């Protein structure tokens, strides 16, 4: 039974590119604050460079027929080819649109594609059309399909522009095939359980210290080390970690024991990694690979490994529960277990020892959506303001 895309689901629009005779998968991305214009994020080299799907996920608000959309403008449903759909950026909360303003990227008959705050007007609405004759108008849209999107406002296709040296996204009369990948389904999401792509705090077994980086003493290189702190750090944004799965499709699925994932520090935008000297140190996105940045959750420190279980499509089954389940972090390749060094604002350093300590369990707590939004805003604004300061100093 092939499952069908439905409204209120989180999806990512990905297009395949053919730069110098190789196929690399590119996902449509946007950033809420600052640049309204959309861009592309590469997902082919996930083993070498992590993909940032938090800015690529979109939600299917409403699927309406063309005449229903016209009547509404004059004033859980399965998507059908030829319907008018509304896409909201999950992070920003703003909707995709045709900006009606062009960057003049050598295409005079083109419009830039970006995010828009308001839902009124026909700029935000898009029409989905079948790729080939296998599908037809009025048919249900399958999770695995190629789609061409036509803007209602300008009758332009969501187009991948090869003309510029850098790959762009724009509304052009040429058509580009888009494939939809389901990230998560809200209705089938069990409450209180861990889902992929959640910003969360690692509460240590004492229930009063969190895994965090040093405070913002203006030393960016000093921010890289990882340790335990207790007190207000549990309320600050410097102890927020996002669990990113190694898979693009069905990333927002219930996390099972032993499933590899990457832990990203939201404030610094850096991934937790195990250096060869057994000491944890945050790496950059460019050099964050699967070899060092892969981690798993184990129910117990018992050495019988789960072997290999193939990832299953769909939302999956909920195993790890928030606030009560006890988890032990183990590096995938080295097999080391995360523990506190206990060397003596506790500032108790955390290292990985394959034997480990006895109270190495870590509970999981959800950060609020407001807290995650604010932390991402802080990271983006720090980056922009640092660039501005460097330019002014130059």
């Amino acid at each position: 039974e092939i499952q069908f895309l439905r409204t209120d689901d989180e999806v990512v629009l990905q297009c395949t590119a053919t730069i110098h005779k190789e196929q690399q998968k590119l996902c449509l991305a946007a950033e809420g604050f600052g640049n309204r214009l959309c861009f592309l994020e590469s997902t082919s080299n996930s083993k070498n460079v992590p993909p940032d799907l938090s800015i690529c996920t979109f939600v299917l608000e409403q699927s309406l027929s063309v005449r229903a959309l016209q009547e509404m403008l004059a004033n859980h449903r399965t998507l059908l080819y030829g319907h008018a759909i509304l896409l909201r950026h999950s992070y920003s909360g703003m909707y995709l649109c045709c900006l009606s303003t062009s960057r003049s990227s050598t295409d005079k008959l083109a419009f830039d594609v970006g995010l828009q705050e308001d839902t009124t007007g026909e700029a935000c609405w898009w029409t989905i059309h079948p790729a080939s004759k296998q599908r037809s108008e009025g048919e249900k849209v399958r999770v695995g399909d190629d789609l061409i999107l036509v803007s209602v406002s300008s009758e332009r296709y969501l187009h991948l522009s090869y003309g510029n040296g850098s790959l762009h996204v724009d509304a052009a009369f040429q058509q580009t095939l888009w494939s939809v990948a389901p990230i998560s389904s809200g209705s089938e999401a069990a409450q209180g359980y861990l889902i992929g792509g959640d910003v969360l705090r690692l509460l240590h077994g004492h229930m009063d210290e969190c895994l965090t980086v040093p405070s913002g003493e203006h030393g960016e290189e000093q921010r890289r080390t990882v340790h335990y702190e207790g007190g207000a750090v549990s309320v600050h944004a410097r102890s927020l970690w996002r669990l990113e799965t190694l898979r693009v499709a069905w990333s927002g699925s219930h996390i099972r024991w032993g499933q590899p994932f990457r832990l990203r520090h939201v404030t610094t935008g850096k991934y937790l990694s195990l250096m060869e000297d057994k000491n944890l140190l945050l790496m950059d996105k460019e050099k964050a690979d699967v070899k060092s940045t892969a981690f798993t959750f184990r129910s117990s420190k018992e050495k019988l490994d789960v072997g290999v279980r193939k990832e299953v499509d769909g939302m999956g089954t909920s195993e790890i529960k928030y606030g009560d389940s006890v988890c032990y972090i183990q590096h995938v390749d080295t097999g080391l277990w995360l523990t506190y060094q206990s060397v003596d604002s506790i500032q108790r350093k955390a290292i990985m020892h394959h034997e480990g300590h006895m109270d190495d369990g870590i509970s999981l707590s959800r950060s609020q959506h407001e807290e995650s939004r604010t932390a991402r805003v802080i990271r983006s604004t720090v980056f922009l303001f640092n660039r501005f300061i460097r330019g002014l100093d130059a």
Partner: protein
Amino acid sequence: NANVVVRLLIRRPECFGPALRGEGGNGLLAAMEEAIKIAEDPSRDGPSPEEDDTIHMGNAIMTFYSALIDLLGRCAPEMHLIHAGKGEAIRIRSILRSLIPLGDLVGVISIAFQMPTIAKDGNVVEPDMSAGFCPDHKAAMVLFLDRVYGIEVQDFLLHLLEVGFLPDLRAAASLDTAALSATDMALALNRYLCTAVLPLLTRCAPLFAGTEHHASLIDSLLHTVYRLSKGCSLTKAQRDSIEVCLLSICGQLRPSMMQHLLRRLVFDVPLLNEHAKMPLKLLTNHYERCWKYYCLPGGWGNFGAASEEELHLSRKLFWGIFDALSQKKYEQELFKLALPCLSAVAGALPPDYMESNYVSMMEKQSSMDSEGNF
């Protein structure tokens, strides 16, 4: 049938020509400018191993682009639907505006023509119209501009006039000589002006109210239109159109600067020729609209009062018309239509008017001139 055609054309962008395909395009203005040079060059225009033997490639490209623009402008929705706010009409007009920039249309209209000229022997050497730039090309431009982009800004109207229209009317007025009137270029330019350029200015008559500071350009437009009206080769329908346009613009025009055309009026009207119908109608409606400006000492507060130079001119006009009409033989429509003119002039003229002892000295000899009037 218009929405379907527009959608098919936008789905197949190659139908718009290499200039407007978008990818590696130069624009409509650049395409027409390059077609100019193609027409100038013999090798690129012709095969080189009139029209049936030699297709003029520059004119072919020009006509293709003009036809595309004309078709799109005709595909533009009616203005009543846009006033009603119909979404499809709004969308179609927006698509057309995105397809064709306004600046390109203004530039193509600004492209000048090559006038026919007399030769040493006295023969009018006539450029081949089928070889180069023709007035119909700009006639399509105007239709697109007034059916898609719309002409509703006073500043934009003045800009368009100055850059592209007024030079064409000046060229027509210069070609209005009897020897050069018979030239086919003169006929085509007359058709272009009387069909596309001038009715547009007729429909844009209300916008002409706020032209006080741009007195020179509107005076030039008035004088060129009057000179074109004093043309031998103009057809009956063309004469009707020019009369209607001129009387429409004069009515909305500020009373002040139109004395620069009244000065030619006082010299041309007393002739009482067949050409004098439109002039005297213009006098009738202007004086009936601006009677209180002349008689009442203050006049309209915005308009002001007479400079007494206009008072003297109107005196000369009145008495010349009266004397000519008195010595003129009885013609039915002439005395039916002159009564309102003479009566309106008399009513506008203040009864207490001091006649100026200052006679004018050394008037514009172009005005006293009658063999070409220059």
